[PDB]
Amino acid sequence: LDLTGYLDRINYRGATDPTLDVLRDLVSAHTGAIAFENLDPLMGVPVDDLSAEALADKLVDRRRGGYCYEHNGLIGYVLAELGYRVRRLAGRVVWLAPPDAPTPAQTHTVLAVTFPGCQGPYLVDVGFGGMTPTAPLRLETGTVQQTALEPYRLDDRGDGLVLQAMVRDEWQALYEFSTLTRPQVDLRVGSWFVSTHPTSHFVTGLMAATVADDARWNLMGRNLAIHRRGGTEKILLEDAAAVVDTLGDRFGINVADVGERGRLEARIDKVCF
Numbered sequence: 001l002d003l004t005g006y007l008d009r010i011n012y013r014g015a016t017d018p019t020l021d022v023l024r025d026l027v028s029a030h031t032g033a034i035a036f037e038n039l040d041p042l043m044g045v046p047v048d049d050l051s052a053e054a055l056a057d058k059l060v061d062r063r064r065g066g067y068c069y070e071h072n073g074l075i076g077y078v079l080a081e082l083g084y085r086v087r088r089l090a091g092r093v094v095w096l097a098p099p100d101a102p103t104p105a106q107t108h109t110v111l112a113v114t115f116p117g118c119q120g121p122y123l124v125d126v127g128f129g130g131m132t133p134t135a136p137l138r139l140e141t142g143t144v145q146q147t148a149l150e151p152y153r154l155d156d157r158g159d160g161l162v163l164q165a166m167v168r169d170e171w172q173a174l175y176e177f178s179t180l181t182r183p184q185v186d187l188r189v190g191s192w193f194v195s196t197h198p199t200s201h202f203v204t205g206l207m208a209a210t211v212a213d214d215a216r217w218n219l220m221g222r223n224l225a226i227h228r229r230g231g232t233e234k235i236l237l238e239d240a241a242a243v244v245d246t247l248g249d250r251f252g253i254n255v256a257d258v259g260e261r262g263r264l265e266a267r268i269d270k271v272c273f
């Protein structure tokens, strides 16, 4: 119910009516202000509470980032309060995987959004780390949808859909999802798995992502990548202390919220180095 707190956090100043332009402006403000991060699962802190109060406490009041369940959870509550009709969906991540790869777990969550006067439903995803669409996408197959960054495309895959994006020089399948509404409890089960399981990439490693000035800032451990329209520059971070500095400065995460910096640096040192 802390609508004001959220809007100030994302530095939004426009209108609040449930329209297409507002949805575009909110998604752009959210993706540019709240970083993607897995500092909680990395530090052995599970992501179990997906209520409006818990997510606003962390992502707004404490100035932290989060992952898919936290990002799409928070924006989903905000949009519902503004008058948008929000349906929470579940997805399986297939990024960089070939078509014959083993069936992935349902560890991603996206939103199907409608509003007064809309021609059709819209896909909203502000929680897909390094490749999250910075614009609401028409929930329709075949159409190429250009954003402020990469172009996106949805295609019909079996009993559901698949979101694809043109990364570098080829169309890459990001995730496959069903358009069926999933209850909150199913999302909690998925979030528990991805934040506690010893095999999860969010437990074993560090991942951080943001968007700032027509560019994508992606961090995989000590590997920082800045993806621009022109090209990509890669920076190999020297030590765990420099990694924490990047998380605080470049990514705008309140690192002090995690606890003693020495413990976070030691965890990054043992995991990334």
Ligand SMILES: *CCC(=O)c1ccccc1
Binding pocket: 067, 068, 069, 093, 095, 107, 108, 109, 127, 128, 129, 130, 194
């Ligand atoms: C919650 C899952 C999530 O945020 C994610 C999965 C796979 C790749 C990027 C982000």
